[PDB]
Design a protein around this ligand. Sequence first.
Ligand SMILES: CN(C)CCNS(=O)(=O)c1ccc(N/C=C2\C(=O)Nc3ccccc32)cc1
Length: 278
Amino acid sequence: MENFQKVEKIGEGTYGVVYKARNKLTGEVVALKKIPSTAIREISLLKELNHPNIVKLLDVIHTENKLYLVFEFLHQDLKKFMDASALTGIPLPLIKSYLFQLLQGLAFCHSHRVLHRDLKPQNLLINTEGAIKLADFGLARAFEVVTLWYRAPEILLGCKYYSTAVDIWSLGCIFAEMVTRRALFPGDSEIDQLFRIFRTLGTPDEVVWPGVTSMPDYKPSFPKWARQDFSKVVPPLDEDGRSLLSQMLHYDPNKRISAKAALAHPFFQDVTKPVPHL
Ligand SMILES: CN(C)CCNS(=O)(=O)c1ccc(N/C=C2\C(=O)Nc3ccccc32)cc1
């Protein structure tokens, strides 16, 4: 670590504090995250998982029982950009570009059997060129209140062997939030999160989600709410966008659209790559 000069604190991350730093050997500006052998090996595998829509893991430094992760640096996260665009809204072509790029990143990771598990606006980073990238990819398998807003229902219901579908759910929640300028399911406890999902999408049952009633944290005493139309949930999203969103928010993880199939969706027939106003 004597090769890095800290510039400023850029986040109180999930596993530790993230700093903007300068590498003295290469002159490179980086993001430095200060965090067992199982972890060293899994983290070392993430150094090979390179894609244009994944924030690059440059190096892993294990010294004096501390672990430092050196990442590519980007200047803004999607949370800040959404807050800055609250009065006007992010233009639909840019929302579409960002969703398309994030699905490309997820298709890549998922093809290598790597899950993110904690997608949220704070770990989606943007640049001046119109790119958006997934940050902290794979750190949840390897290792302030953690937000539950983007957590898939199977996780909330106690599935310990969940799938790549959890990342599609989180991304669907983020898509809805870009469109409406408000979080879709802002729960402040696990039960509040689950019941907010149920109030919008309907309480799940064996018809829509075979096996749901046997899940660990499923309770037959859950209230039975009717499902709402998506036209009420994400106005003024068009029918292609609503169709895609509905497929990203299917209850059954097996029915939920994959990232690769989502890329082929008609919503992306007119996708472009606009420059954001930063
Ligand atoms: C100092 N303060 C107010 C900044 C917080 N808000 S921000 O400007 O939107 C902002 C600026 C930069 C960042 N970077 C975050 C990361 C980065 O670059 N690589 C990473 C790899 C893994 C995890 C995080 C990052 C985020 C937000």
